Design a binder for this molecule. Structure first.
Ligand code: CLA
Ligand code: CLA
Ligand code: CLA
Ligand code: CLA
Ligand code: CLA
Ligand code: BCR
Ligand code: LMT
Ligand code: HTG
Lengths: 51, 121
């Protein structure tokens, strides 16, 4: 079968599922941005922009 | 000349009475007559809280806050003596009234500041 390091090659001739995988990647990245901002807001101390 | 039912729920009960722009005269004080304040009303419009800086040598400012306990803040129905002193000055001595309100305001960032807004004694 496909070796582990080639599993994603099944996308090469499937534009639809390639677009799906790209959508999922983009979802994951937007989700990371959202999560990261929420975490920073949960930890950020705004009381002293000087020091 | 409003009634309770005119007023209830409007938020007007937390507001002090007002005087027209025409009321710019003078109330004569007879030194021999005894005086009283029959009704003193105090309607807070702004609550400022002095910040607490980190370097402790920086000038600390009073900053605006958000009232979070609604229209429950005013002092009213306060009465007391109005004395006419030797030097012509007047001195109000509070004797009774709804002369306090617990108030919670909130600072930018979420910190809540409860205070006993008051003119007791
Ligand atoms: C952007 C990320 C991404 C996307 C869009 C895809 C998409 C695809 N994968 Mg690939 N894959 C990925 C990452 C991704 N993969 C990663 C990181 C691994 C290593 C684990 C794999 C290993 C892998 C294998 C072995 C196979 C695929 C296959 C496929 C295809 C079928 C779907 C599937 O079975 O996924 C399965 C993938 C997963 C279930 C990913 C596991 C999730 C990881 C481990 C994190 C856990 C998620 C959780 C919410 C976070 C935990 C946080 C932590 C603090 C606990 C599809 C094209 C299949 C295929 O078509 O082969 C021909 C297939 O057999 N993938
Ligand atoms: C735009 C970025 C991009 C994309 C879309 C691809 C896509 C592909 N690569 Mg290529 N590649 C890239 C960049 C990219 N690569 C980079 C930067 C390197 C050097 C690191 C490589 C080195 C490389 C090799 C040596 C090979 C590929 C192969 C492939 C094909 C199969 C992938 C697969 O099934 O892995 C499956 C992977 C897993 C099941 C698990 C991988 C787990 C990784 C190692 C650790 C965890 C990664 C982590 C989740 C990443 C987070 C995001 C990151 C940006 C920080 C697929 C066309 C294969 C190929 O050509 O087959 C014909 C292949 O042999 N790539
Ligand atoms: C018709 C004009 C047109 C437009 C506007 C686009 C726009 C896009 N295409 Mg491209 N593409 C086109 C023609 C077009 N394409 C044609 C004719 C082909 C050959 C079939 C392709 C083949 C192609 C492939 C294989 C891929 C793209 C991808 C992309 C996206 C990459 C950026 C992204 O994901 O942002 C992030 C998205 C946003 C910030 C939100 C966008 C809001 C959406 C578009 C509203 C949805 C409206 C509509 C109903 C959905 C389909 C729109 C469609 C025209 C793209 C972007 C939306 C990539 C993609 O989809 O990755 C996820 C991708 O993998 N395109
Ligand atoms: C310009 C920005 C950029 C680019 C070009 C890519 C490119 C890629 N990302 Mg994405 N990603 C990005 C930003 C980007 N990312 C951001 C900002 C986030 C939020 C953190 C993500 C979150 C993300 C997730 C969750 C996943 C990807 C995956 C992928 C790969 C999908 C194609 C593939 O099969 O590769 C095959 C894999 C490789 C070619 C190996 C890449 C190895 C990287 C470069 C370093 C790995 C370091 C080390 C070995 C493991 C990490 C340490 C570990 C202890 C955690 C591709 C390389 C997917 C993937 O890797 O699938 C297996 C996947 O699951 N990305
Ligand atoms: C829908 C529109 C949209 C808008 C308005 C925003 C807005 C924002 N994003 Mg989000 N984001 C979006 C969609 C969007 N995003 C999507 C779809 C994803 C998933 C891919 C993300 C993933 C994401 C991450 C991971 C992060 C953000 C972050 C941010 C903030 C910083 C922006 C920044 O510095 O980018 C800078 C953008 C660039 C430097 C663009 C480089 C473009 C290259 C050079 C183009 C190369 C190819 C091009 C074709 C070359 C030819 C061009 C031609 C004109 C010559 C900002 C609030 C950051 C943040 O603050 O998170 C809380 C952050 O870390 N976003
Ligand atoms: C469904 C739905 C929804 C929801 C959504 C959500 C909720 C999402 C979330 C999302 C999310 C929440 C996401 C997240 C993501 C994340 C990520 C993607 C991450 C990654 C990471 C990584 C990749 C890392 C790595 C590393 C490590 C770990 C160590 C060091 C080095 C490195 C960095 C490499 C709504 C309602 C809106 C609407 C529609 C429907
Ligand atoms: C659809 C997904 C939406 C998910 C929403 C999740 C949002 C999470 C991030 C938003 C910001 C959270 O910000 C949150 O604020 C307060 C004040 O700083 C902090 O709360 C902390 O401080 C306050 C005030 O000193 C204490 O009363 C409290 O006991 C303490 O835990 C939280 O630790 C912080 O995490
Ligand atoms: C999707 C985001 C929805 C979550 C928003 C949480 C409220 S917002 C939150 O409020 C706190 C208290 O006032 C502040 O300490 C903090 O800085 C602020 O980020």
């Amino acid at each position: 079968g496909l070796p582990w390091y080639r599993v994603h090659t099944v996308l090469i001739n499937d534009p639809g599922r390639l677009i799906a995988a790209h959508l999922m990647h983009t979802a994951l990245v937007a989700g990371w941005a959202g999560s990261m901002a929420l975490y920073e807001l949960a930890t950020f101390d705004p009381s002293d922009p000087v020091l | 000349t409003l009634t309770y039912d005119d007023i209830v729920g409007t938020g007007l009960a937390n507001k002090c009475p007002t005087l027209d722009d025409t009321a710019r005269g003078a109330y004569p004080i007879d030194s021999s007559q005894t005086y009283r304040i029959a009704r003193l009303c105090l309607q807070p419009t702004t609550f400022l809280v002095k910040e607490e800086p980190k370097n402790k040598r920086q000038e600390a400012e009073f900053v605006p806050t958000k009232l979070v306990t609604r229209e429950t803040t005013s002092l009213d129905q306060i009465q007391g003596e109005l004395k006419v002193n030797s030097d012509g000055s007047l001195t109000f001595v509070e004797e009774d009234g709804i002369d306090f309100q617990p108030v919670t305001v909130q600072m930018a960032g979420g910190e809540r500041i409860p205070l006993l807004f008051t003119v007791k004694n």
